[PDB]
């Protein structure tokens, strides 16, 4: 017959191989596909969808609904911090278990602009302004509003609109950042600051709630598929 | 180049009024109507078969109003299972017993109003195939603890210890996920600051064209408060939430004696 | 930035273990049985299950590879000279006859797809098409098996694919040898529908969605950062 | 030579493989095919053919010809049942051993309309009407003629025609039903009811016979070929 | 709904065991014989027989695969080092000379098609064309062999295909080893005629259509169903 | 792409009168004539060979009448084997002894009448290659117990215990099948309510073009009652069944001395 | 011989004998000239052959009567639509069936009296 | 052996509440009485099979009929 | 290289196989064929030829 020669790499099982195989049930008539709403062709179209971030994860708040509620209230000295978390999607224990972070944890690289949507769930007669800043990694994390006004910020007035959008841009020295973050590729810091105050009329409760949502913009991308470091089983589930 | 004749053997491919019948809803200030996964509920095509599908258009597609529920401070949330909450509802439920298979879309209109001096946020979501886990593990639950006949099953703030009920911990949504990730399902946020209502139009979501509407809850409607209802003590206290569902393009087949044994 | 590793077919299209079958040459214990069966399910390994259960409805085509490795049982002597072992995997369709024991005539089939393999060769793979009576694979079924809403609640009624039966074709070895066959599933031609939230709580059984309660995220010290 | 690489799945014997093989007797002259009547190209053309159903299988009637004879007779109260069996072709012990059921038992799926032909083997001067109903699975099996008139039925008068045809339609929630039936895919119930009576003149025997025939319509189809669960042998037939 | 699995070529076109030959290296017993013969028939396994006997006349082409597996005989010692065993299957045509014993010169043939196989390789398959003196294979022959209507009643006179002779090519092993060769038949290019009723009663021998009496269907309680 | 030169080495392909000679039958009300497997019995073509085939057209193709049989209440059924029941029949059987090979089609006309006050149903079927099993297993039977010279061999209701006869259990058809599955063979139901006769035209069914018509029964004619004959006791009792067979396009070859040793 | 199909229901035996239609008028739907919201027409799930209880014809039988739409009160989905609705309108096709042998005799009058 | 009458809607109004007004009645009156031989069959049943035709409704409210 | 897959029937010796094989003496110059009378192309052309039958085979 045709003289062949076995190259190295034959008779192996690469688990990510792409080879054909003989069918077990030949000439099988498959039932027809039909219209089912919500066909997903790509995992990034899931990461587009917003999901509310458990910012208030200070135990014991993580076992209840209070982890999603950021408490705001009138102040006596303006310019103080509401919340702030390291921008490590997939690694920081704030938004790692969100819908963006749980998709990111199946990979080892990420690159794209993130979008933070905030929503003031307060009284309709209550007003006030907030400064939502984002500082690039550099050195270091800012420690005041006068320090965290020199980067990228938006000034959200809750009297005008109930929802704000802070589009965190992609300002990096690489093309990709790792999910399990290190000192090489930091991504920066998100903070929020009281611009003026919360000014309410009487007969209004003194404590309110902001929810924070995370999603991915159209330039988001992933790479280097791996196993997720969340689920650990020992034996076969019976 | 393919070597075989079967496709299993290939390689990889690398103000505003909404009228339905003799019923109308209000108030809608032309705010937002969410339609499903981008799909409006229509009738079945001829490609999916199968006798004659029965379509009682006007006498069934109308706004049914359920029992109202009290929104307190310590309210975790509630859920209804459809088409089980519309069981004893007019001529919609009479056609369910006399027919074998069914198919329907919905338009769920949840409405909850308050003053300008109130606050709190609801999440009205429509989860398809919400397979709930057990409260007590290795012990299966009864169907009455999942969904009664149009009765609002409520969540809880802590874990349950019921032997024959579902696990009603509201921060795990009763399913096994995080409750903050429920925004991929079709939903609308009720903000007492600016919304006062929510209207979602849901299509028919299943893996089959028709289905027997007794032994399979097609989807559920969860109403979960994320920001709790706080008001001044001198304000009004009773803040009720009302669910107004209407079927849309309901079809049936398999006409026999009245079920459902 | 072509989103190539974020498609469904790159996500699911990778081999992953789904069952580890164990069978021996001598029935030392009831468990080895001298042969072993496995009803086809994808809810026994967590890593493929969390990939599958991000979607309510799947339509994946399948490729099944086995990695059979053998090892001698611990005795006082081991010196022998045996011909190479031949293994047999007989896919029994749902409702078909099953082997009641070894030396049965159900292994000498006429319609059941079977495969043979001698040790030392390449691992044997076969393909199985879309095996369903409906139009999709339901990863979650929110209902009951009986019309009176009783019997079985969950996805188990719609998961009916058959059995895999593992045995040794050789009649006897001079010293007993235990074989371990690791079934690997590789989805292909995958179409998904209705994306679900990713699972938080670790699994507990294989026939339900039962869970224990967990927090949504591990906690931190404060809500604000503080450094110059 | 040509550098090759062995993929997994080589040197195996899949018993449903489709591969060529060297011939043992080459250049062999085969005797010519001729005209033989009754060439079968498909197993469904056998399942088209009717076969009489052993409805009266109450032991000891299965060891004699009486299992095929359904006894009818004049009544004193109209509206009673003659026969009734669960529509499980291949699994119900009425028509599993028929010509349709024994072909269905070689498979694991079935989908199509079935046709029931009944034949009144009574006296020529005898008359009467029967209600032959079919109720979809639902809940549950009907228990009266007033209950089993609300589905699909035909009213067969044995004075007009001696044979009736009840075409059982395909009303299912799936594309296919299993042969070894379960609670997931029931197929319904066939019943027969006395519409009025059997009215004979004198000098006629008081007991008659209906035979029942089963076949398959043009929309019948099978899938997932397997071994039949009827024949069990232990050793080789010598 | 393409009736693809209901055609004749999808129905019969699947490998199924037809004979299990047993032969040893040492003639411990008369039965092993140190070699073994088998006249070709398809009436020894029930599952292929019921597929064949739904039709009166067949015209199938054939493919024959063997799965030979060996195993050591039970002795007091087993430690040895042997070269791999070579097996030989010699298809003897009808009327040809047969081997009278081992070490005969009929195994060193000149026209009989033979095949060789060393253990560890792929299973050897060969194809045999339509072997008949007529225009079809008669699954049922309603007549006698002699013109005076005597001798043999049945299909046995028209079933004349030859013999398969199994032996070990290696002369001697240091300890005896029993080999088990399982013949697999796969019909192809199948044309059928005159469909017959499916067999009810289980078979009793291989050269006739003899049966014991059975009921037509297992019985039930009543003739009518009764529930609300 | 095929690799070999032999096709064994390929892969799979994935009122009314009917006159014959000087004979006619009656009564037929233009009811039903079943023709074989869709094939009318014709003469042999030139492609099947092999001297000169002898065709005595008019002197052989005629309606022969057999002996009548009594249909009682406890009658299980009967069977005849052709071309053995037409052995001593005129010039049809004289041509069988003098010739080596033969080939013929048939037109079997079974006739059994009764009044309007009778009832019962017959199955007239034509089974080709009806290889019958043994009554006593591991003991071969004689040919005289299978088919005599034109004599109606009858079935039985229970199992037989004959050492050298066929197994005559009528619910197993004498073959090993269920008797209810005999409708795939060419047949016609006699209903005493509406039929009174049955006429089946059978072609030549074999695996060879010609065959010696002594050592191979080409087909059999089973007449099995499915509904038993019940009548009033004051009616007529003797209800006879008569079989009238005619050959159709009979051919012969191999002219030698008269057989059949 | 002649089959009359309404929904998933058929009747037999009719030897193409006689079908009486009303006062020459076939039952149709209402026109737009008569008003009055939206009229509900469950076509297939209601227009089907319901079978009542059978009655014994003795020698000393004087006769029977049924009143419609009261005899179809508990009949499937026809009677469920009667309770939920204020007004209604329907036509009918009454099929009375009573067979006997050739050795019987007797004559029935099947009449439909309005009001 | 049978009788089939198709009846239209007969009223003085286009629609009517189908509880408090019987629209028509079906009388089955034997004019010649049923005589048979005593050795014949005795039970002779009469069966009424009614089907509605083009049924319309209006006025959708709660289930009646008080 | 090219991914292959061994089908059953490989590495065997069917004695009636038709396969090519590497030559032992390559580029060998064969002496030319010439005219020899009586070339037989088929065994049936031998069976055409008559041969006298030993009919009287009664020993001795």
Residue numbers in the entry:
A (entry chain C), D (entry chain C): 1 to 238
B (entry chain B), F (entry chain B): 30 to 43, 82 to 117, 120 to 330
C (entry chain A), E (entry chain A): 57 to 284
G (entry chain B): 82 to 117, 120 to 198
H (entry chain B): 265 to 330
I (entry chain C): 1 to 60
What does the original paper state about this entry?
Human enteroviruses (EV) are presently classified into four groups, Enterovirus A-D (EV-A, B, C, and D), among which EV-B, the largest group, consists of over 60 serotypes, including all 6 serotypes of coxsackievirus B (CVB1-6), coxsackievirus A9 (CVA9), over 30 serotypes of echoviruses and more than 20 newly identified enteroviruses. Most of the uncoating receptors bind to the “canyon” sites of the viral particle, dislodging the “pocket factor” in VP1 and subsequently triggering conformational changes of the intact particle to release the genome, albeit that SCARB2 binds EV71 outside the canyon.
Here we report the structural characterizations of E30 E-particle, A-particle and mature virion, among which E-particle and mature virion are compact with fully ordered epitopes, showing the potential to be ideal vaccine candidates. Natural empty particles (without RNA, termed “E-particles”) are often also produced, in which VP0 is not further processed into VP2 and VP4. We separated out two distinct types of particles by ultracentrifugation and characterized them using SDS-PAGE, single-stranded RNA detection and analytical ultracentrifugation as either 143S F-particles, containing RNA and a full complement of proteins VP1–VP4, or 80S E-particles containing VP0, VP1, and VP3. Apart from some disorder on the inside of the E-particle, the structures of full and empty particles are mostly very similar, with the external surface expected to be antigenically indistinguishable. Superposition of the asymmetric units (protomers) verifies the similarity in capsid structures of the F- and E-particles (RMSD = 0.4 Å in Cα atoms). Like most enteroviruses, E30 F-particle possesses the hydrophobic pocket in VP1 harboring a pocket factor, whereas both E- and A-particles lack hydrophobic pocket and harbor no pocket factor.
